C-alpha cells in the first residue's frame, strides 16, 4: 500500500506541475479592453399559480412555450406560458420528488426522487389520458437528476455515488459510471450528446464518455458540496455552484480553472446556475430568496432578480433566449424578460 | 378569442377546481418523521420509504422512515420528529447523544419539535439491580449526582433505578436546552416495548405544538 500511495502522490504532483506550465495569462487581464455590459433590468411578465407546496424542479420544452414543474404535493403540471393555461395534471405514486425532465420530441416526461425509481410518462396517445410507460429500477440511493438523450435513452445520477445509462424499451442498465466518493447532485449534457459532466459532495467534478464508459478528467477547486453544473454554449467549458457561496468556471482543453464569482456580502449557498444564449451572462440562484446576474467575462454583478418570498430552487433559459423562468419554495413560478 | 382558446380556458378551470379539492382534502392529515438507530425497537412503537397510518380521536397521522445531511431538507415542514434511543447499552449512549446533538442544531430543522422516547427500561432496571455494570465507568459525574428533592416522582421502584433514569433524561434535556432560543421544544418519555399508551402521547404533544404555533401567529407570544 505504501508504494502505491507514493506512486499516486508522485503522479498527482506531476499533474499539478503539468497544468501549471500552461498558465501564461489570466482571463481577467485578457478582457480588460472590452466594454462592460452595464446595468441589466428585468421585470416579471407572468406568474404561475396552482401549486400548494414547495417546488423542486422545472424544465423547458424545445418549442420555448411549454414547461413542466414538480412539487411536493405529488403532482406534475404542464403549463402554456403564453396564456398561463394548464394542459395536464399528472398525479404521482410518491410525493418525494426531486427532479423532472422533458423529452426533446415532446412525447414523454420523466421524474424521480426519494423512492429510487425513474418513471416515464406517455403524453400523447389514444384514450385521451396520460399513463405510466416505464419504471426503471436498480439504484441504491435517491435520484438527483435525469436528462433525455432521445426517446429510448436516458442518463441518471443518484446518491449511491454512481451514474447510469438506460435503455427504456428493455428497461436495463447499459453503462455504469463509477469513481465519485460522495453523493452526486447534478449533471449536464453536451450539445453534441457525446459527453457529460457531474458534480458531487466530494467537492470535485468529472467528465465522462458516454460510449466508452470511462472518466477522462477531474476538477478540484471548491471546498464544500457542489449543487449545480451547466455547459457553456460552445461546449468547451462549464460552470459550477457550491455551498462555498462562490461560482467557478472551468476549461476542458486547459484542464484548470479560469474565473471565480464571489462577493463579500454573499454568505449563503448556490442552488442553480444557467447561461444565456451568447454565453455572456451567468444566472445563479441563492438561499437569500433572490437571484444574481453575473458578467461571465469580467466577474462583475450586473443585476438582481428579487421577487420571491422563500428559497429559490430551480432555474431555466429557453432555447431562443427570450425569457427566464424561476421557481421557489413559496409555491410560485415567474417568467422574466 | 377563438373557440378553441375558450375551451382550453374551461379545461384549465376544471383542473384548478380539482387541484383545490385535492389540497383541501390533504390539509387534514399530519406528518411525522421517524429517526433512530439499530437495536432501539424503532419499528415497534405504535402497536425506500415504509409508511404507517393510524388515527386517534378522529385525527389522522402519517409516519415515515427512510432505510443524511442532504435528504433531510425535504422534511422541513413536518409536525414533529420522533427520536428513539435504547437506554440499556451503556457503550453507545455517547453515539446517541452525538446524533441527537447533530439533529438538534441542523440549519433546516430550526423550527421543528422533537418527541424523545427512551426505550427498553425493563432491561435497564434489571441491569441496575444486577450490579455487574457501573454507569460511572463511562460517565464519572454519575457518582456526584443526586436526585432532585422536590422533583422526584416514582411509581414504587428502587431509588437506584430512579437515579439512573433521571441522569440520562437530564443529559438529553440539558443538551436540548443549551441553545434553542425557545423556538422549539423537546418532549421526553419512558417506554418498555410492551406499552400500548404510545399513540396518545404523540397526540398530546402535537396539540401542544399546534397551540404554540397558533400563539405565535397572533403575536401573543
Amino acid at each position, epitope marked *: 500500500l505504501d508504494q502505491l500511495r507514493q506512486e499516486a502522490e508522485q503522479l498527482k504532483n506531476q499533474i499539478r506541475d503539468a497544468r501549471k506550465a500552461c498558465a501564461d495569462a489570466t482571463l481577467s487581464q485578457i478582457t480588460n479592453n472590452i466594454d462592460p455590459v452595464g446595468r441589466i433590468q428585468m421585470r416579471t411578465r407572468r406568474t404561475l399559480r396552482g401549486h400548494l407546496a414547495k417546488i423542486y424542479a422545472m424544465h423547458w420544452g424545445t418549442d420555448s412555450r411549454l414547461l413542466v414543474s414538480a412539487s411536493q404535493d405529488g403532482k406534475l403540471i404542464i403549463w402554456d406560458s403564453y396564456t398561463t393555461n394548464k394542459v395536464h395534471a399528472i398525479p404521482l405514486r410518491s410525493s418525494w420528488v426531486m427532479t423532472c425532465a422533458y423529452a426533446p420530441s415532446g412525447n414523454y416526461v420523466a421524474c424521480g426522487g426519494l423512492d429510487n425509481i425513474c418513471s416515464i410518462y406517455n403524453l400523447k396517445t389514444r384514450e385521451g389520458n396520460v399513463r405510466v410507460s416505464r419504471e426503471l429500477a436498480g439504484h441504491t440511493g435517491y435520484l438527483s437528476c435525469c436528462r433525455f438523450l432521445d426517446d429510448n435513452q436516458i442518463v441518471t445520477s443518484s446518491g449511491d455515488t454512481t451514474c447510469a445509462l438506460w435503455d427504456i424499451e428493455t428497461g436495463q442498465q447499459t453503462t455504469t459510471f463509477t469513481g465519485h466518493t460522495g453523493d452526486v447532485m447534478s449533471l449536464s449534457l453536451a450539445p453534441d450528446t457525446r459527453l457529460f459532466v457531474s458534480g458531487a459532495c466530494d467537492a470535485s467534478a468529472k467528465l465522462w464518455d458516454v460510449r466508452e464508459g470511462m472518466c477522462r478528467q477531474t476538477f478540484t477547486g471548491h471546498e464544500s458540496d457542489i449543487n449545480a453544473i451547466c455547459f457553456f454554449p460552445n461546449g468547451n467549458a462549464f460552470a459550477t455552484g457550491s455551498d462555498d457561496a462562490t461560482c467557478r468556471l472551468f476549461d476542458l482543453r486547459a484542464d484548470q480553472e479560469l474565473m471565480t464569482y464571489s462577493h463579500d456580502n454573499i454568505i449563503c449557498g448556490i442552488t442553480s446556475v444557467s447561461f444565456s444564449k451568447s454565453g455572456r451572462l451567468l444566472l445563479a440562484g441563492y438561499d437569500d430568496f433572490n437571484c444574481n446576474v453575473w458578467d461571465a467575462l469580467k466577474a462583475d454583478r450586473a443585476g438582481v432578480l428579487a421577487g420571491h418570498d422563500n428559497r429559490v430552487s430551480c432555474l431555466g433559459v429557453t432555447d431562443d433566449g427570450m425569457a427566464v423562468a424561476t421557481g421557489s419554495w413559496d409555491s410560485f413560478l415567474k417568467i422574466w424578460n | 378569442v377563438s373557440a378553441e382558446d375558450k375551451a382550453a380556458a374551461e*379545461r384549465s378551470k376544471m383542473i384548478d377546481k380539482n387541484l383545490r379539492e385535492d389540497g383541501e382534502k390533504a390539509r387534514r392529515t399530519l406528518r411525522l418523521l421517524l429517526l433512530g438507530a439499530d437495536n432501539s425497537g424503532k419499528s415497534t412503537i405504535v402497536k425506500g420509504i415504509f409508511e404507517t397510518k393510524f388515527q386517534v380521536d378522529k385525527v389522522n397521522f402519517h409516519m415515515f422512515d427512510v432505510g443524511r445531511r442532504k435528504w433531510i431538507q425535504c422534511f422541513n415542514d413536518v409536525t414533529a420528529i420522533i427520536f428513539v434511543v435504547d437506554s440499556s447499552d451503556y457503550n453507545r449512549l455517547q453515539e446517541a447523544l452525538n446524533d441527537f446533538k447533530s439533529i438538534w442544531n441542523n440549519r433546516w430543522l430550526r423550527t421543528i419539535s422533537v418527541i424523545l422516547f427512551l426505550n427498553k427500561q425493563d432491561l435497564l432496571a434489571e441491569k441496575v439491580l444486577a450490579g455487574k455494570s457501573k454507569i460511572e465507568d463511562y460517565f464519572p459525574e454519575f457518582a456526584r449526582y443526586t436526585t432532585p428533592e422536590d422533583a422526584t416522582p416514582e411509581p414504587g421502584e428502587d431509588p437506584r433505578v430512579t437515579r439512573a433514569k433521571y441522569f440520562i433524561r437530564k443529559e438529553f434535556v440539558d443538551i436540548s436546552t443549551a441553545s434553542g432560543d425557545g423556538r422549539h421544544i423537546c418532549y421526553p418519555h419512558f417506554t418498555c416495548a410492551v406499552d400500548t399508551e404510545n399513540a396518545r402521547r404523540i397526540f398530546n404533544d402535537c396539540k401542544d405544538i399546534i397551540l404554540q404555533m397558533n400563539l405565535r401567529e397572533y403575536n401573543l407570544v
Partner: single-chain antibody, 231 residues
C-alpha cells in the same frame, strides 16, 4: 375506440324521438361531443354541441327550440331529443368526439350512424364537383371561403375530411397544415388566407370518394359542398 348509435326509424310529422350514443374505449368525460347529420344525397351539416362538464351548449338556427342535447358521464351515453319533427329532418346522424388544448387534434373519431325518416355565417364553397383520376398521378383539390380564417394568434382554422363509399368520414388535415395520426405521408395541405388547396401525390386505390373542407373559426360550423374523385 368505439361509438355506437341507436334509435332511428319511421316517424309521422309532428312526432318525437330520442337518439342515443354509447361510447367505450376512451376517457369519455374529458371529451366534447358533436352531432352532425347528412341528407340522403346532400353534404354534411352541423347540429349541436355539448362541452366537457356540461358548461357550454350550442345549436344551429334550423333546429333551435326543438332539439336538446345532454350527456350522462357515469353511463358514458350521449342523447338527443326530437320535438315537432318536420320533413326536412330526414337524414342520417353522426356522433363526433373532440378535445381542446394546445396542440390537440379535434374531430378525430366518427361513429357509424342511424337513419331517421319522416313521412352572419361564413360561406365557403368548392367549385369542382367531379374529377376523373387514374392511379399513379397527382391531384389537387381546392376550396375558398368568404372571409379570412387567419387569427391574430397565428393559427388558420380549416379542416379536411374524406368519406369513402358506404363508410364514415375520416380526418386528414387539421388547422390547414398538420397530418393526422395514421394518415399516409402522400397527403399534404397548404394555402393562404381565403384560398386553400389539398395535394395528393402518387394516387392509389382506396383513395376515392368525396372530400369536404370545414371552418372552425366561429359558430355555427359550416361545411363545403364536396368534390368527388372517380376512376
Amino acid at each position: 375506440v368505439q361509438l355506437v348509435e341507436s334509435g332511428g326509424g319511421l316517424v309521422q310529422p309532428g312526432g318525437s324521438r330520442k337518439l342515443s350514443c354509447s361510447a367505450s374505449g376512451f376517457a369519455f368525460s374529458s371529451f366534447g361531443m358533436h352531432w352532425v347529420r347528412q341528407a340522403p344525397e346532400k353534404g354534411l351539416e352541423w347540429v349541436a354541441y355539448i362541452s366537457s362538464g356540461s358548461g357550454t351548449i350550442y345549436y344551429a338556427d334550423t333546429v333551435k327550440g326543438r332539439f336538446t342535447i345532454s350527456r350522462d358521464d357515469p353511463k358514458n351515453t350521449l342523447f338527443l331529443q326530437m320535438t315537432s319533427l318536420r320533413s326536412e329532418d330526414t337524414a342520417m346522424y353522426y356522433c363526433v368526439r373532440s378535445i381542446y388544448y394546445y396542440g390537440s387534434s379535434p374531430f378525430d373519431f366518427w361513429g357509424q350512424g342511424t337513419t331517421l325518416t319522416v313521412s352572419s355565417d361564413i360561406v365557403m364553397t368548392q367549385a369542382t364537383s367531379s374529377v376523373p383520376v387514374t392511379p399513379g398521378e397527382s391531384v389537387s383539390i381546392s376550396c375558398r371561403s368568404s372571409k379570412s380564417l387567419l387569427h391574430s394568434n397565428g393559427n388558420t382554422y380549416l379542416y379536411w375530411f374524406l368519406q369513402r363509399p358506404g363508410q364514415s368520414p375520416q380526418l386528414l388535415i387539421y388547422r390547414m397544415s398538420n397530418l393526422a395520426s395514421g394518415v399516409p405521408d402522400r397527403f399534404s395541405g397548404s394555402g393562404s388566407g381565403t384560398a386553400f388547396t389539398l395535394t395528393i401525390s402518387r394516387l392509389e386505390a382506396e383513395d376515392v370518394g368525396v372530400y369536404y373542407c370545414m371552418q372552425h373559426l366561429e359558430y355555427p360550423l359550416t361545411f363545403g359542398a364536396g368534390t368527388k374523385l372517380e376512376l
